[PDB]
Amino acid sequence: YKLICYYTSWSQYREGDGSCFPDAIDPFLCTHVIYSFANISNNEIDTWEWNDVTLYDTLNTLKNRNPNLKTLLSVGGWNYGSQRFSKIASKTQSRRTFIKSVPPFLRTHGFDGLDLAWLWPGWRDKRHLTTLVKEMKAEFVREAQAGTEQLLLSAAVTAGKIAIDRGYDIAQISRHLDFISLLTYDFHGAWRQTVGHHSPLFRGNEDASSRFSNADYAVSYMLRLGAPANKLVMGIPTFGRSYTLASSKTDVGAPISGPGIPGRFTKWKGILAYYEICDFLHGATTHRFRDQQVPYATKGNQWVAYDDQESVKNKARYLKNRQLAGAMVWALDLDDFRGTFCGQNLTFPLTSAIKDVLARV
Ligand SMILES: *[C@@H]1O[C@H](CO)[C@@H](O)[C@H](O)[C@H]1NC(C)=O
Numbered sequence: 117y118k119l120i121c122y123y124t125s126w127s128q129y130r131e132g133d134g135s136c137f138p139d140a141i142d143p144f145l146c147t148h149v150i151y152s153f154a155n156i157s158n159n160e161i162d163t164w165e166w167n168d169v170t171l172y173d174t175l176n177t178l179k180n181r182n183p184n185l186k187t188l189l190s191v192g193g194w195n196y197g198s199q200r201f202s203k204i205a206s207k208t209q210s211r212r213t214f215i216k217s218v219p220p221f222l223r224t225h226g227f228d229g230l231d232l233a234w235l236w237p238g239w240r241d242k243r244h245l246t247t248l249v250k251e252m253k254a255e256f257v258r259e260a261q262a263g264t265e266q267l268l269l270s271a272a273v274t275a276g277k278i279a280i281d282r283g284y285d286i287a288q289i290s291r292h293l294d295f296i297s298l299l300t301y302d303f304h305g306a307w308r309q310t311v312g313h314h315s316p317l318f319r320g321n322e323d324a325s326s327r328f329s330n331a332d333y334a335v336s337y338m339l340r341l342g343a344p345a346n347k348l349v350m351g352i353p354t355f356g357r358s359y360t361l362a363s364s365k366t367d368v369g370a371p372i373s374g375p376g377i378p379g380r381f382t383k384w385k386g387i388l389a390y391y392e393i394c395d396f397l398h399g400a401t402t403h404r405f406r407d408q409q410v411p412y413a414t415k416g417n418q419w420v421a422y423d424d425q426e427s428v429k430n431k432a433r434y435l436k437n438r439q440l441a442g443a444m445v446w447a448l449d450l451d452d453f454r455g456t457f458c459g460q461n462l463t464f465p466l467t468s469a470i471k472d473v474l475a476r477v
């Protein structure tokens with residue numbers, strides 16, 4: 117079973133104990149560590165941060181400790197225009213340039229493959245995504261002839277039905293792709309004007325309007341679209357999402373003034389790391405959607421949906437049962453990587469729980 121874990125570049129800037137470098141990653145924790153993100157420039161893959169060449173190095177030296185560790189490099193992310201990606205892919209010449217740029221760069225910096233994070237394609241883009249995957253893989257096949265082990269190619273895929281139908285030929289891309297990481301953590305946002313969970317496993321017959329907005333739909337549906345189970349990797353968030361409440365209503369349907377306040381360390385409105393969440397839980401009221409099998413918490417005018425060790429195990433079992441290739445984690449830097457915030461003296465609580473479960477019968 118794969119354990120695909122994402123590291124974010126920009127986690128290096130958070131103050132104090134928030135600062136995460138590739139240093140902190142235990143090299144027997146994951147099977148694949150993916151480095152986000154790379155920039156494209158003159159139609160060629162490129163660094164993003166000023167010191168990625170160093171952080172690249174620091175991550176790829178972990179393979180000294182675990183010779184079996186596979187590392188990849190992710191291109192795009194949200195930071196970065198779909199507009200821009202589309203422009204590069206829809207022309208045969210920029211596409212080619214970008215594809216040829218990729219292996220030499222990967223090799224130079226010691227990566228084992230590429231993750232495409234095009235977030236996300238439009239309906240006009242679906243045709244070019246397929247071609248790009250196809251052609252990129254053919255390139256990885258042709259470079260394998262040179263005696264180095266064949267590069268891996270993977271893709272980050274949105275778990276929302278509307279988005280999958282708009283932007284992805286799943287059946288086709290599944291052939292050329294080594295695995296697909298399904299982003300089953302986005303099933304809600306602050307654009308809905310109430311409370312709700314964003315990673316729920318099941319719809320939970322609290323009240324389908326979306327019966328589509330849950331991990332299980334997303335998984336059935338990708339299999340139904342023809343993603344082999346053995347290429348499919350279910351995404352499990354390590355962060356939580358916060359919402360400022362608009363009243364003392366707190367259950368399902370409770371209205372929302374907007375996103376919750378910034379976390380002390382992550383400093384983004386609407387998001388918290390698990391380590392910031394473990395601290396929030398002190399003096400909060402805890403609840404668990406029975407149906408959807410995920411927890412929330414609330415205190416003051418703050419309401420938080422999150423994943424904890426139990427829900428994360430539970431998702432790990434679900435995917436074993438479903439016979440999928442593994443789990444995908446977003447993200448290491450947002451898990452309790454120092455192991456000091458959540459009571460126990462365990463680092464990467466959330467990710468270890470998955471890993472333990474992935475090793476059971
Ligand atoms: C990424 O590449 C673009 C396009 O060349 C360039 O303008 C931009 O400044 C780069 N962004 C970063 C953060 O390096």
Ligand SMILES: OC[C@H]1O[C@H](O)[C@H](O)[C@@H]1O
Binds near residue numbers: 194233235272
């Ligand atoms: O939902 C957008 C997400 O996709 C990216 O891959 C990250 O997981 C980012 O937060």
